[PDB]
Amino acid sequence: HMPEEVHHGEEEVETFAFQAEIAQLMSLIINTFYSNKEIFLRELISNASDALDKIRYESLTDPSKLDSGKELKIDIIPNPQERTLTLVDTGIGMTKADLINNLGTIAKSGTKAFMEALQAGADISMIGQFGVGFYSAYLVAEKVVVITKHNDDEQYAWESSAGGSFTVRADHGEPIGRGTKVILHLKEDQTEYLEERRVKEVVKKHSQFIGYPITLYL
Ligand SMILES: CN(C)c1ncnc2nc[nH]c12
């Protein structure tokens, strides 16, 4: 008795290409010698704050949207053994469609405009002004994993090593309830951001007036 599941039904792991504009920016960011790489943390905390604003805005008319979790917070978890730095927020999260669209497609206009601005003398720290600060994670990360849960969909995982493609798959792991977890697999030369002394310095310098609690976990 040796059965075989010739066809699993849905495709578990789906691979897609970035819009060319996004892929070219990711290549720029992952290989640049820009000396102020710490700004990645500002951009990711700002994205987390925006996501928390969103859920809060939504709950004003429908308090039940907080049934998946009442606390609105940001957590930063450096992990020296796995060389990961994780930023967790309990914000709005992303459905599967929005996950593919928001990280793989809709950033096209922002990444295009940002690269034109860079060509004309702008600098990388302005990335957030084009709505695409998420990709600054590749200043310090060789790989990024995003775990996300939106009230209207199941938990999903996104990942990319900036090779022009990304993958999406249902995540049946530890439920996060609601929100997004951005997991940075750090480059060898950027492990300074695994140290509590360094991470605090960056938060105090760049994110000292964010309207949500930021907790650091060692
Ligand atoms: C980057 N992006 C589209 C995001 N969407 C929703 N929640 C987020 N938390 C951090 N980044 C997020």
Side-chain angles (χ1 to χ4, degrees), residues 44 46-52 87 89 91-94 98 102-103 134 146 148 179-182:
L44 295 180
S46 162
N47 284 350
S49 178
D50 290 351
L52 292 162
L87 278 89
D89 71 71
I92 186 90
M94 284 177 280
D98 290 346
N102 289 357
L103 302 189
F134 166 79
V146 176
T148 192
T180 299
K181 184 161 63 131
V182 181

Side-chain angles (χ1 to χ4, degrees), residues 152-166:
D152 296 347
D153 206 347
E154 68 187 70
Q155 192 161 303
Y156 276 91
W158 175 104
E159 69 76 29
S160 180
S161 302
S165 297
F166 62 93

Side-chain angles (χ1 to χ4, degrees), residues 55 57-67:
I55 188 69
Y57 177 98
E58 283 196 16
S59 77
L60 284 192
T61 56
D62 187 355
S64 77
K65 300 209 191 271
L66 290 177
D67 292 334

Side-chain angles (χ1 to χ4, degrees), residues 53-95:
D53 289 348
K54 184 85 180 80
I55 188 69
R56 242 172 82 194
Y57 177 98
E58 283 196 16
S59 77
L60 284 192
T61 56
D62 187 355
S64 77
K65 300 209 191 271
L66 290 177
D67 292 334
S68 49
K70 285 284 205 81
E71 195 181 0
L72 302 183
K73 57 160 183 164
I74 302 169
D75 296 326
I76 302 177
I77 304 128
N79 186 332
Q81 292 179 67
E82 289 288 343
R83 218 199 286 161
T84 58
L85 181 65
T86 299
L87 278 89
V88 189
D89 71 71
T90 54
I92 186 90
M94 284 177 280
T95 66

Side-chain angles (χ1 to χ4, degrees), residues 178-189:
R178 186 202 60 250
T180 299
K181 184 161 63 131
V182 181
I183 305 166
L184 310 190
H185 295 256
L186 296 182
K187 307 173 171 162
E188 293 175 353
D189 60 317

